[PDB]
Design a protein around this motif. Sequence first.
Motif, mmCIF file in Angstrom:
data_model
loop_
_atom_site.group_PDB
_atom_site.id
_atom_site.type_symbol
_atom_site.label_atom_id
_atom_site.label_comp_id
_atom_site.label_asym_id
_atom_site.label_seq_id
_atom_site.Cartn_x
_atom_site.Cartn_y
_atom_site.Cartn_z
ATOM 1 N N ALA A 281 0.814 -1.201 0.000
ATOM 2 C CA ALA A 281 0.000 0.000 0.000
ATOM 3 C C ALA A 281 0.848 1.251 0.000
ATOM 4 O O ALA A 281 0.518 2.206 -0.699
ATOM 5 C CB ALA A 281 -0.953 0.008 1.183
ATOM 6 N N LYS B 164 5.753 4.302 3.154
ATOM 7 C CA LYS B 164 5.820 4.515 4.605
ATOM 8 C C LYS B 164 5.294 3.297 5.376
ATOM 9 O O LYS B 164 5.265 3.288 6.612
ATOM 10 C CB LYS B 164 5.061 5.781 5.018
ATOM 11 C CG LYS B 164 5.462 6.338 6.382
ATOM 12 C CD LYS B 164 4.519 7.441 6.828
ATOM 13 C CE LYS B 164 4.771 7.875 8.271
ATOM 14 N NZ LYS B 164 3.977 9.105 8.592
ATOM 15 N N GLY B 165 4.875 2.269 4.644
ATOM 16 C CA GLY B 165 4.575 0.992 5.255
ATOM 17 C C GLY B 165 5.860 0.442 5.843
ATOM 18 O O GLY B 165 6.953 0.752 5.358
ATOM 19 N N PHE B 166 5.731 -0.359 6.900
ATOM 20 C CA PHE B 166 6.883 -0.945 7.560
ATOM 21 C C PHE B 166 7.406 -2.081 6.717
ATOM 22 O O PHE B 166 8.617 -2.240 6.544
ATOM 23 C CB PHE B 166 6.504 -1.440 8.952
ATOM 24 C CG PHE B 166 6.432 -0.350 9.989
ATOM 25 C CD1 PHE B 166 6.803 0.965 9.679
ATOM 26 C CD2 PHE B 166 6.031 -0.645 11.295
ATOM 27 C CE1 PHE B 166 6.750 1.971 10.646
ATOM 28 C CE2 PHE B 166 5.971 0.350 12.266
ATOM 29 C CZ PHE B 166 6.335 1.662 11.944
ATOM 30 N N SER C 149 -1.090 7.982 10.971
ATOM 31 C CA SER C 149 0.324 7.626 10.933
ATOM 32 C C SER C 149 0.501 6.237 11.540
ATOM 33 O O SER C 149 1.366 5.464 11.129
ATOM 34 C CB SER C 149 1.133 8.661 11.723
ATOM 35 O OG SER C 149 2.482 8.262 11.887
ATOM 36 N N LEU D 275 -1.065 4.040 8.583
ATOM 37 C CA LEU D 275 -0.297 4.009 7.339
ATOM 38 C C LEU D 275 0.919 3.092 7.430
ATOM 39 O O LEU D 275 1.274 2.422 6.461
ATOM 40 C CB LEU D 275 0.133 5.422 6.941
ATOM 41 C CG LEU D 275 0.634 5.614 5.504
ATOM 42 C CD1 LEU D 275 -0.436 5.283 4.466
ATOM 43 C CD2 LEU D 275 1.116 7.044 5.339
ATOM 44 N N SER D 276 1.541 3.072 8.606
ATOM 45 C CA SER D 276 2.707 2.237 8.879
ATOM 46 C C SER D 276 2.369 0.743 8.824
ATOM 47 O O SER D 276 3.190 -0.080 8.407
ATOM 48 C CB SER D 276 3.284 2.597 10.248
ATOM 49 O OG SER D 276 3.553 3.984 10.340
ATOM 50 N N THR E 296 -2.759 11.768 5.450
ATOM 51 C CA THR E 296 -1.592 11.781 6.333
ATOM 52 C C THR E 296 -0.742 13.020 6.118
ATOM 53 O O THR E 296 -0.796 13.636 5.056
ATOM 54 C CB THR E 296 -0.722 10.523 6.130
ATOM 55 O OG1 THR E 296 -1.550 9.350 6.194
ATOM 56 C CG2 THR E 296 0.370 10.425 7.196
ATOM 57 N N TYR F 201 2.517 12.835 6.193
ATOM 58 C CA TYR F 201 3.551 12.361 5.283
ATOM 59 C C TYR F 201 3.198 12.747 3.846
ATOM 60 O O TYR F 201 3.993 13.387 3.151
ATOM 61 C CB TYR F 201 3.704 10.854 5.387
ATOM 62 C CG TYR F 201 4.430 10.236 4.218
ATOM 63 C CD1 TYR F 201 5.770 10.527 3.963
ATOM 64 C CD2 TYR F 201 3.780 9.346 3.370
ATOM 65 C CE1 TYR F 201 6.438 9.948 2.883
ATOM 66 C CE2 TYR F 201 4.438 8.761 2.300
ATOM 67 C CZ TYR F 201 5.762 9.065 2.061
ATOM 68 O OH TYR F 201 6.401 8.473 0.997
ATOM 69 N N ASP G 5 0.312 6.521 -2.726
ATOM 70 C CA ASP G 5 1.083 7.624 -2.162
ATOM 71 C C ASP G 5 0.897 8.848 -3.010
ATOM 72 O O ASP G 5 0.332 9.854 -2.567
ATOM 73 C CB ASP G 5 2.571 7.287 -2.150
ATOM 74 C CG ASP G 5 2.990 6.512 -0.925
ATOM 75 O OD1 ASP G 5 4.204 6.552 -0.607
ATOM 76 O OD2 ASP G 5 2.119 5.882 -0.275
#
Lengths: 219, 173, 97, 204
Positions: free
Chosen positions: A48, A51-53, D38, D41-42, D58, D60, D105
């Motif tokens: 997705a 900034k996804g881990f 945040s 999104l992570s 976000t 970001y 994004d």
Amino acid sequence: AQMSKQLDMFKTNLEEFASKHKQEIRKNPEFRVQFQDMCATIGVDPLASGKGFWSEMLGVGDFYYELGVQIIEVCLALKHRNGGLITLEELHQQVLKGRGKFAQDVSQDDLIRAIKKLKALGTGFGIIPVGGTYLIQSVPAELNMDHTVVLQLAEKNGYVTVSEIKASLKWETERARQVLEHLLKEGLAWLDLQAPGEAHYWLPALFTDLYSQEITAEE
Amino acid sequence: SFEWPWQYRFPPFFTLQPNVDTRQKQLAAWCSLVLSFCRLHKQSSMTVMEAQESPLFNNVKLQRKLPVESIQIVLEELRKKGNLEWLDKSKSSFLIMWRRPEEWGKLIYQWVSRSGQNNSVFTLYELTNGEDTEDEEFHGLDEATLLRALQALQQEHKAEIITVSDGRGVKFF
Amino acid sequence: FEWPWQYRFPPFFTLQPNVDTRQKQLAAWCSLVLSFCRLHKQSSMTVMEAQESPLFNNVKLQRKLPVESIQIVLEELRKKGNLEWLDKSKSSFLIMW
Amino acid sequence: KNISEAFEDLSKLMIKAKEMVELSKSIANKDETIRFKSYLLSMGIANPVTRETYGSGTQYHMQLAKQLAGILQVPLEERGGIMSLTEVYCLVNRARGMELLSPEDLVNACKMLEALKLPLRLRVFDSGVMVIELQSHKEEEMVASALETVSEKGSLTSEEFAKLVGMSVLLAKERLLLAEKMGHLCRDDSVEGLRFYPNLFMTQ
């Protein structure tokens, strides 16, 4: 910070997970699918975001997001021969030809993965099931379910024929001829008046020629 | 070693396509192919009858051939693009020049100018077949294309075609 | 009578999707079909009958008015008067003058 | 050898995530929840019908929207003040080693370009085609010159027009459909193709 505690928890679990299993996801196709197919059960998407881990540590983002650029470019370089339709085979063959000393690292499944994300750029890309593979559309066209069905019929010989349309799909003549007209107007079919029996409509997207792709490298 | 283009092996290529964006494309491909088929077979002169039967407009294996009307169409495209000249009162036999005389006379001028031979005389033979040329693009250029060349160069202001020793000549300016 | 500038204008044989334009189109079509029935004299036929008729088919130019589009100009030509359908199975009509 | 360290400890990894999942959907019903986005999104747990109910996107994405204003300014100029999103997505990820951009994004950053008062602006055509344009560009204002081009040539298809004017086939289609919407061009649809002609019906 009720949720943020468990947030930092996960960060360090995954990083370890990454450190000893980095190149595996990058080394064998069969393993990628596993990781991915479990994610969608959970309700998470590793692809997705950047900034996804998952992407940050595993690198599945920069692999696929990059695969999209490459898929876009191959389709454009080819859009003049074939109209904006390409088989998943030829796409694959070409993405590899242009990846270099890493000309195996990508699977058919990877390509389809990437196109699904490309759909979010808006109308543009589309995946069309046929016999036992997929066609990829890279230029807009309309809903006509009638257009899909003919594509699917075309797929068995690279061409289609009014008489064949009517018999296989049990359609009225005007209806067959109308979709044919669309295939011509879009550049997806060319007419052939020297064919046995009656006019044939051949789609360059099908039709195997395994050569060149330069001059049109300029996007 | 010239390769046949993907279109040549595609049945439809051999039919005048009704869709107009496809036709433009069909015809740019036919033009590119005729020019490059001649360039390869070193031919500068053919007839409509003579051409109609080449493996140029007839894929014998694919069992398709480009009809006469459609070829008259591509020949007429080349003609106006500057590559083809009819040389028989009634449209039947023609000169076919894989590169345009304008580009020709230009290359030839460039060679003359960066030679230290800017104000002097050349026989037609010397330019195409001489020792001085050999390594230029115009070496081996058939007499007719060479004329058009110098005739374009004349029409500008850069060359006059003369009569020399016991032959056909040209002075460069 | 004598053919109008539209009859030489290729877009006239495609139904315009722009509503302002379609009106002027639709109108010009009514004005012509009611006008033509002086030359051929006949005042009545069917869908297929018109398909090979010069009022809907310009050969020296190209293209003809699609059958589907014929049904649109007809509806207006009936709700103007100057028409009735002579059967309830939807085919064949009576165009007056 | 070391794949069995994965196949298992991977099956366990999911449980760990699942907790952040299960107990975050309950968190839906009542910086406020900015930190939650945040937080979301992570993970990659999208939640549009709660996220975009309260808290939009976000920060970001925001930091990124301004990135692109600078990035695209000249490329836009070079291309006539308008690019489809897919041409943009290429322009941007191709000019990068790593840390590239997902389609979401780039799309989400783009989505707030407006509220951020930056000079670029995301539009969506009725085809569904997304595009980006400069503050100073309006297709509506380009429609005059399109009609001028068509009249100088008698009539023309989308492709022909794109070649002459030096713009992409996609964007030329939109431009001509719009000029049609505005009654400047009518259409001539045949086997020969979909041609645009001056709207002689609205003259003569």
